[PDB]
Paper text:
MM_0014 from the methanogenic archaeon [name] is known as a versatile cis-prenyltransferase that accepts both isopentenyl pyrophosphate and dimethylallyl pyrophosphate as acceptor substrates. Cis-prenyltransferase (cPT) generally catalyzes the consecutive head-to-tail condensation of isoprene units and produces (Z,E-mixed)-polyprenyl pyrophosphates. MA1831 and MM_0014, which are orthologous cPTs from the methanogenic archaea Methanosarcina acetivorans and [name], respectively, unusually accept both IPP and DMAPP as prenyl acceptor substrates. The overall structure of MM_0014 is in a ζ-fold, which is similar to those of so far reported cPTs.
With a final aim of obtaining the ternary complex structures of MM_0014 with prenyl donor and acceptor substrates, a cocrystallization of MM_0014 with FPP and Mg2+ was performed using a different crystallization buffer. The asymmetric unit of the P212121 space group contains eight protein molecules that form four homodimers. Each protein molecule possessed an electron density that penetrated the cavity more deeply than the fatty acid ligand did in the substrate-free structure. The shape of the electron density, however, did not fit well with FPP, particularly at the pyrophosphate group. It is also noteworthy that inorganic phosphate was still bound at the supposed prenyl-donor binding site and that no electron density was derived from Mg2+ ion. However, the electron density was obviously longer than farnesol (FOH), which can be produced from the hydrolysis of FPP. Thus, we speculated that the ligand was derived from the prenyltransfer reaction between FPP and glycerol because the crystallization buffer contained glycerol as a cryoprotectant. We constructed models of the possible products from the reaction, i.e., 1-O-farnesyl-sn-glycerol (FG), 2-O-FG, and 3-O-FG, and fitted them with the electron density. A 1:1:1 mixture of the models seemed to fit better than each model, suggesting that different O-prenylation products are formed and bound in MM_0014.
Residue numbers in the entry:
A (entry chain B): -2 to 145, 147 to 219
B (entry chain A): -3 to 142, 150 to 214
Write the structure that this text describes.
């Protein structure tokens, strides 16, 4: 990417979840149409990827779009779907183990991303990058209720390949999960960046990691 | 002008508030008390939240009491938080509420005293729903189903609009994963025993400012 001066951390999360929210508000603030902000959301994700590789984060899960999101106008659906496709394809030009998780039994799931629905090594690998594409919390839990029993259910949710989230970072100033991986996020420390996702700065992630290293982790204990 | 600051008028209210009354052990340690001594100082704060919610007309409040995960803690701490949870429900039972306790009753950790409240119980004039999670667990809740999603253990408890957590941590600690998927979360840095009405007022200001 480009040269940064990255702070030293005493403790790092194994698995970060990213909610790249605020693209529509960012676009409206600059006098663009709501849907135009998604096309300015790709380079921020590449900056997150570059920082995580440099500091040695093992796994990053990006919130792409949910089944709930596909209720929005067509022009928005096309914009966020196009940006999700480009994002996965950009990580595919780099060093990663890519996994896409979402409901592939839908016309809404992009054909371009089917190849990534089993973990796929690109370049040298050595960081796990997950994308939630046509994901839904309800679809995720009900996958287990249908296809499992009892103790087995939890192990058989749709997102079962994605492990517990240590740190969840959300851009766009809202403090809410928007149904991201309810099972993996029961204990996650949540950090909210007030700036919209397209206004990403390395300091956003540095401040989130400073927050994480200051937390007492009990995982329900 | 009066003893207490007046309860503000809010332009938007949540239908359902979740409360995580965290920080009791850190509060106790900071005062030079033993870890388990914080819990008994967390009961009056709950009654203050109850009183304020009745005054503004909040429809439903769910209090995080203790989880199955929490019963991994030392016996002296388990007895302290269990005793304080029992007292809390009994104090609401002397007032005006529709009380529901949700939790795994199939345990010698679940207090016999609260079995009568595992079906929704109208006390006094009712007019507010008060829920307590007692020996609750997210894993127990989701697996209880064994349509299935609508038959989770906590099915009677609706979507949480606003979740307020004391003790400065921004995390759910497995509180109602299904009901909290879209919840707005407000964190109070002060430990729960240091509850002030302004904590709840600022949380409600936060909620009414959301889009
Ligand atoms: C690693 C890389 C390269 C990109 C990762 C970030 C990403 C998926 C950017 C695509 C833009 C996008 C649809 C963000 C999703 O925002 C959601 C919440 O607000 C839905 O509207
Ligand atoms: C409505 C009323 C009156 C009281 C409700 C609050 C209550 C049950 C107090 C009881 C003691 C207490 C605070 C327990 C909470 O501790 C948990 C959080 O950290 C442990 O996991």
């Amino acid at each position: 990417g480009y040269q940064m001066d990255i702070p030293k951390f005493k403790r790092l999360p194994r698995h970060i979840a990213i909610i790249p929210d605020g693209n529509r508000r960012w676009a409206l603030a600059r006098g663009l149409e709501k849907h135009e902000g998604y096309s300015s959301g790709i380079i921020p994700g590449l900056e997150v990827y570059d920082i995580c590789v440099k500091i040695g984060i093992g796994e990053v899960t990006f919130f792409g779009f949910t089944q709930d999101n596909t209720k929005r106008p067509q022009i928005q659906r096309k914009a966020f779907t196009d940006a999700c496709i480009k994002s996965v394809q950009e990580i595919a030009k780099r060093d990663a183990e890519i996994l896409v998780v979402g409901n592939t039994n839908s016309d809404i799931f992009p054909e371009e991303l089917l190849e990534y629905t089993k973990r796929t090594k690109v370049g040298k690998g050595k960081i796990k990058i997950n994308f939630l594409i046509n994901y839904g919390w309800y679809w995720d839990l009900t996958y287990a209720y249908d296809n499992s029993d009892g103790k087995k259910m939890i192990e058989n949710i749709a997102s079962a390949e994605i492990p517990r989230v240590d740190l969840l970072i959300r851009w766009g100033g809202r403090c809410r999960l928007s149904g991201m991986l309810p099972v993996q996020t029961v204990y996650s420390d949540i950090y909210v960046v007030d700036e919209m996702w397209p206004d990403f700065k390395p300091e956003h992630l540095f401040k989130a990691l400073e927050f994480y290293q200051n937390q007492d982790i009990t995982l329900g204990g």
